[model samples]
Target: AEKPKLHYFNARGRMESTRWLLAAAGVEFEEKFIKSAEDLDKLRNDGYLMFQQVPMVEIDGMKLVQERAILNYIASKYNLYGKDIKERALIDMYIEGIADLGEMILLLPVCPPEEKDAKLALIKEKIKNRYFPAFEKVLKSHGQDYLVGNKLSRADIHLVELLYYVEELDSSLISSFPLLKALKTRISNLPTVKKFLQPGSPRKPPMDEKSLEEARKIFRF
Candidate 1:
């Protein structure tokens, strides 16, 4: 089978979640970086992108766009979703819920400098006050190893991914939640993810001002 292909700018942006889930699924994929604005125009004009928007991905013979749609497909195809309808529902809710912090994580790079400080400050508090406690309570109550269905599902992968970004903002972000802290180490230690975490993986470098502006130019934002 041909490896999946990721189309996006060099920065993490919205494609990072797709990258993380693919890593957790142990899929080795390819990437096409839009180095110039013309690259995006080319892909779009070639009829490969839906809604004429990128971060479009080529996987299993389909040109997929929209981050959420791509994620749902990968999560389902990779057996990281869940085994039952009810279990899948829980996973959906957890992913949607964490998307609160997830959105902040993705926006940090592009946020106007004038508001970045306040955004970062407010984000940390919400994760500490709202997100972590809710998840911690679930872990404490369920006595299970993972977030849903007692296995590594999309929910666990998504949370662990978000947790890593939160930690980058402040390493102690998960210190108060032992389960989350432990989960972070556990997921990072997976052979595939461990390799992905190493020095030269496809994981995007943390965003910078110059790269952010370049990405903006390519995406026409």
Candidate 2:
């Protein structure tokens, strides 16, 4: 079988989840990091980078783009999606929820500096009052660390990344929800994932502190 080659920006932004899924499945793939204008232009000239986006993966000589599609394809191939139709639907629900949270975070970068503080306040309030509590309910009702069925799925991988993001935004973000905290640790300790996140791993630092503080100050109440 041909080796898979993933192309993305040097940053861990959207491509990291696909990397996590591939690593968890024990797949050895090559990474093509676009760090310069020349590298990006080269990819653009080559013509497979539809929508002029990074996070494109070439496997079995087929090029695939879009973060969610690539992640779903990788999970499906690795049997990390779900066991059956119903489970798949449940997994999709969780994945969509995580995407919604992720989309909100992605908005921060483009926010005008003057407006950023207010935007952060709104985001923090939504996460604290709506998102986190609702996910906690899902965890309690499911009675398991993994989001669906009795095993790990793409949903767990997606959620772990979000949990890490939340914790980064404010170290105490998940402290009130032990189940969510345990879920984060359980996924982190998975042998493959642990190895993937070891010191000197390609993982980049989370979004910086100044921005997090601006966002977190509104949640103190």
Candidate 3:
């Protein structure tokens, strides 16, 4: 009877995956941004954040915290978690790999000025030489449009979201992965995801200088 409400900075950070999953699930949700250090203080003061963190969510009348915990709940609830233990584990294994590459990009906003270039060099290397091939391997070997069991799952949505970010580094980044390229093409065109991509959607923007400073302020821990 109520919409899920997400608490986080207006930036993507760890919270964007939760946004993507809900969008892909075709569920309408609202968000409360922590715009200042005081805003984060209010969550703990208000006593709703179980782990004292952003990305805490109100869903099913419960407050879900931890990035993966939030995603797993939404994934399972929306039937994007895969059908059984084996398939679910497969989805887990695949997205864990995606998360590693995701973390590489996640670091840039907070990265020190001198090391950003060296970090990005390594990020590009990991994507091209390591992670992208694994996804391509699965798409080629699994013989399905989706990552597991021929159905869209959390893994697929996360992959496309990561793809969107990394491609900011280079638009043609996925060109080397032929089948993975096709997967990005079709999955993004899905109506749920497409609607989320439209202008003025709640989908967060790519990280920028102001956004990074906003995150830094809120995370002054």
Candidate 4:
């Protein structure tokens, strides 16, 4: 079978995790880079584009929009979805929850300064008190190093991606969840993942000191 064709724009805000998913799956995809507004508009005219959004996945002539759905699709296809029904549910729930964090944290650059304090405090409390403990419970229940199993699932990779973002956004943000920090480091060091992030790769957002410092201030991390 021919490999699927994947198209996405430059911004990593919404589709970064998906990119990581593709990498982990060992799936060959046609990655089309869209760098400008005109690029997007031109892609939209291609009829196959869904909702005119970048990060659209075209598989076997079908197009999928919504980043989360695309992630799930990739996960399911690659056996990254989960090992069983409960594990799959756990994967979906955890992935959705982590994505929620992503959405909130990514809002920093656009949020007004006056709202930053309130927004960040809320993240600290919720992440520390609620989400962190819940994830800890999952890890404790599994009694293993991985999130859903001994082998890293899509959930593990998604959380790793998000944790990397959180830590980069604010290293001190890690104070809320030590386990998650360790997990992120562990996943980044995964052999497959390390290969995916091979030297000189053309990924975006590049996570520079200045940009991450700005993310820290914005998210109050």
- Which candidate number maximizes lDDT? 3
Model 1: per-residue Cα lDDT over 1-221, one tens digit each: 67999999887888988998898889999998889989889998999987988889999899999999999999999999899899988888889988877887788867788999999899989999999998888788888889877788888878888888887789988888998888888888988788888979888777877987897788778
How many residue pairs of model 3 clash at the backbone? 0
- Name the lDDT value of residue 23 in candidate 3: 97
lDDT tens per residue, model 3, 1-221: 57999998888888999999999999999998889889888898889888778779899998888999999999999999999999998999999999988988988756778999999888888888999989999998977899999999999999999989877888777888988878888998999999999988789888888787777778883
RMSD of each: 1.3, 6.2, 1.1, 5.0
> Which scores greater on lDDT, model 2 or model 4?
2
Candidate 3 TM-score, true structure as reference: 0.96
In model 1, the clashing pairs are none
Candidates sorted by TM-score, best first: 3, 1, 2, 4
The residue-by-residue lDDT of candidate 4 on 42-155, one tens digit each, is 878877666766567777566888887788788888899878898888788988898788788777556688998889888777677777677777877756779885777998
Alpha carbon lDDT at 178, candidate 4: 63
TM-score of each: 0.95, 0.89, 0.96, 0.83
Estimate candidate 2's RMSD in Å: 6.2
Give me the runs in candidate 1 sitting further than 4 Å from their true place.
Answer: none
lDDT of each: 0.87, 0.79, 0.89, 0.73
> Per-residue lDDT of 1-221 in model 2, one digit per residue for the tens?
77889887555667778877888777888888765666766787889888766778998677898988798888999999899999999888888988888887876765878998888778788888888887788899979868788888888888888888877667777778888889889999999889877886656566565534533342221
